Design an enzyme around this catalytic site. Structure first.
Site, PDB file in Angstrom:
ATOM      1  N   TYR A  15       2.975  17.478   2.559  1.00 13.94           N
ATOM      2  CA  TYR A  15       2.707  18.514   1.563  1.00 13.94           C
ATOM      3  C   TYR A  15       1.197  18.792   1.443  1.00 13.94           C
ATOM      4  O   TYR A  15       0.775  19.923   1.166  1.00 13.94           O
ATOM      5  CB  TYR A  15       3.326  18.151   0.200  1.00 13.94           C
ATOM      6  CG  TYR A  15       4.837  17.942   0.206  1.00 13.94           C
ATOM      7  CD1 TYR A  15       5.708  19.005   0.422  1.00 13.94           C
ATOM      8  CD2 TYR A  15       5.390  16.687  -0.034  1.00 13.94           C
ATOM      9  CE1 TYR A  15       7.087  18.815   0.419  1.00 13.94           C
ATOM     10  CE2 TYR A  15       6.766  16.486  -0.040  1.00 13.94           C
ATOM     11  CZ  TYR A  15       7.608  17.554   0.186  1.00 13.94           C
ATOM     12  OH  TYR A  15       8.970  17.363   0.180  1.00 13.94           O
ATOM     13  N   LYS A  33      -2.759  12.298  -3.611  1.00 10.79           N
ATOM     14  CA  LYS A  33      -2.270  13.379  -2.758  1.00 10.79           C
ATOM     15  C   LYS A  33      -2.682  14.726  -3.353  1.00 10.79           C
ATOM     16  O   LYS A  33      -2.489  14.974  -4.542  1.00 10.79           O
ATOM     17  CB  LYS A  33      -0.741  13.324  -2.615  1.00 10.79           C
ATOM     18  CG  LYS A  33      -0.167  14.359  -1.651  1.00 10.79           C
ATOM     19  CD  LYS A  33       1.310  14.127  -1.458  1.00 10.79           C
ATOM     20  CE  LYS A  33       1.874  15.032  -0.379  1.00 10.79           C
ATOM     21  NZ  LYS A  33       3.219  14.564   0.068  1.00 10.79           N
ATOM     22  N   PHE A  77      -1.917   2.155  -5.093  1.00  9.28           N
ATOM     23  CA  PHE A  77      -2.449   2.050  -3.751  1.00  9.28           C
ATOM     24  C   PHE A  77      -1.925   0.789  -3.078  1.00  9.28           C
ATOM     25  O   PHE A  77      -1.949  -0.286  -3.673  1.00  9.28           O
ATOM     26  CB  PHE A  77      -3.981   2.029  -3.811  1.00  9.28           C
ATOM     27  CG  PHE A  77      -4.649   1.882  -2.474  1.00  9.28           C
ATOM     28  CD1 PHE A  77      -5.171   0.656  -2.070  1.00  9.28           C
ATOM     29  CD2 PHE A  77      -4.772   2.972  -1.620  1.00  9.28           C
ATOM     30  CE1 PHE A  77      -5.797   0.523  -0.841  1.00  9.28           C
ATOM     31  CE2 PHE A  77      -5.393   2.840  -0.390  1.00  9.28           C
ATOM     32  CZ  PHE A  77      -5.912   1.612  -0.001  1.00  9.28           C
ATOM     33  N   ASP A 122      13.558  11.706   3.704  1.00  9.79           N
ATOM     34  CA  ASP A 122      12.666  11.673   4.867  1.00  9.79           C
ATOM     35  C   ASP A 122      12.161  10.286   5.165  1.00  9.79           C
ATOM     36  O   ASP A 122      10.967  10.082   5.427  1.00  9.79           O
ATOM     37  CB  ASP A 122      11.498  12.661   4.717  1.00  9.79           C
ATOM     38  CG  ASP A 122      10.835  12.993   6.059  1.00  9.79           C
ATOM     39  OD1 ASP A 122      11.398  12.646   7.123  1.00  9.79           O
ATOM     40  OD2 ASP A 122       9.753  13.610   6.061  1.00  9.79           O
ATOM     41  N   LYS A 124      11.067   7.113   7.028  1.00 14.02           N
ATOM     42  CA  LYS A 124      10.468   6.804   8.329  1.00 14.02           C
ATOM     43  C   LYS A 124       9.441   5.689   8.127  1.00 14.02           C
ATOM     44  O   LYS A 124       8.971   5.497   6.997  1.00 14.02           O
ATOM     45  CB  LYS A 124       9.804   8.040   8.933  1.00 14.02           C
ATOM     46  CG  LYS A 124       8.870   8.775   7.995  1.00 14.02           C
ATOM     47  CD  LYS A 124       8.433  10.080   8.628  1.00 14.02           C
ATOM     48  CE  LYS A 124       8.257  11.157   7.580  1.00 14.02           C
ATOM     49  NZ  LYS A 124       8.302  12.531   8.166  1.00 14.02           N
TER      50      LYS A 124
END
Length: 293
Positions: A15, A33, A77, A122, A124
């Site tokens: 994104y 982000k 984090f 998603d 992974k």
């Protein structure tokens, strides 16, 4: 913003861009982000939802800040992602007890999400983050098509198909929690073998690599499959390969669990909660990785 001091860019997500940052006031070190670009109501409240989603095995979403034509997501984090740890462990392999601990924790994370009605979509290795204490956490949850395509990120970066469930590939619009179990199965096999289970380079190649290994699905193993939107009778018919060649040298408990995670039929695919009860985890422990930070 001047709330945060950028330390370094740590990634470019699906994104936007992700930074390691410190709270210019509290000194707290977080992952930030940044997404450029009203903000969809569909999004604005499914994201603010994700803040309520708190679990030891889900990366904590600390804050959501909409400001000056941008949206910032502030996360706890962590030390490193699973992909980096896998590449660094490629010579000797990740030790089975650590693989087992990671799989167990991720199934706990998934069981929690899924019982809350939240899908990742998603999964992974790139989206799994680990720390020095042997914890592994689900990161960068996928938005429900709030961001779909739209074409790409408002930025660059190619997308991985390697962990996509076959029902998604076949055009199922209303796919379920089973899609995360499929992806987690693929990650499980990859930790064991050190090599991606289904490394496709296009949507059809992805599908066909699945078929080549698990057998082309038909109405016998997956009722309704031939009525799926992208299904074609012209699909080549591959025979199912024996499962012992797929993830050697994984033991039978492991292979049994993995086969249930890779069931074609999403309604027969094992649930995260049921997977936690599988005999594979009878001797589960929590070892610590050796991490170079």
């Amino acid at each position: 913003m001047e709330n945060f001091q950028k330390v370094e860019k740590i990634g470019e997500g699906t994104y936007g861009v992700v930074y390691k940052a410190r709270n210019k006031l509290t000194g707290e070190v977080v992952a930030l982000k940044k997404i450029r670009l009203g903000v969809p109501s569909t999004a604005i409240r499914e994201i603010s939802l994700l803040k309520e989603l708190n679990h030891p095995n889900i990366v904590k979403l600390l804050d959501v800040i909409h400001t000056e034509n941008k949206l910032y997501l502030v996360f706890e984090f962590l030390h490193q992602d699973l992909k980096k740890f896998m590449d660094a462990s490629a010579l000797t392999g990740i030790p089975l007890p650590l693989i087992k601990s990671y799989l167990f924790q991720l199934l706990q994370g998934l069981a929690f999400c899924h019982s809350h009605r939240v899908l990742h979509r998603d999964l992974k290795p790139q989206n799994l983050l680990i720390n020095t204490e042997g914890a592994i956490k689900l990161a960068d949850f996928g938005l429900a098509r709030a961001f779909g395509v739209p074409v790409r990120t408002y930025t660059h970066e190619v997308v991985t198909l390697w962990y996509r469930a076959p029902e998604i590939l076949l055009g199922c619009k209303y796919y379920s929690t089973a899609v995360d179990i499929w992806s987690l199965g693929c990650i499980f096999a990859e930790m064991v073998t050190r090599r991606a289970l289904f490394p496709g380079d296009s949507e059809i190649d992805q599908l066909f690599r699945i078929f080549r290994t698990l057998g082309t699905p038909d109405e016998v193993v997956w009722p309704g499959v031939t009525s799926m939107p992208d299904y074609k009778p012209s699909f080549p018919k591959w025979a199912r390969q024996d499962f012992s060649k797929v993830v050697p040298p994984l033991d039978e408990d492991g292979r049994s669990l993995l086969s249930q995670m890779l069931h074609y039929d999403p309604n027969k695919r094992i649930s995260a909660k049921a997977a936690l009860a599988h005999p594979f985890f009878q001797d589960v422990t929590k070892p610590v990785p050796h991490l170079r930070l």
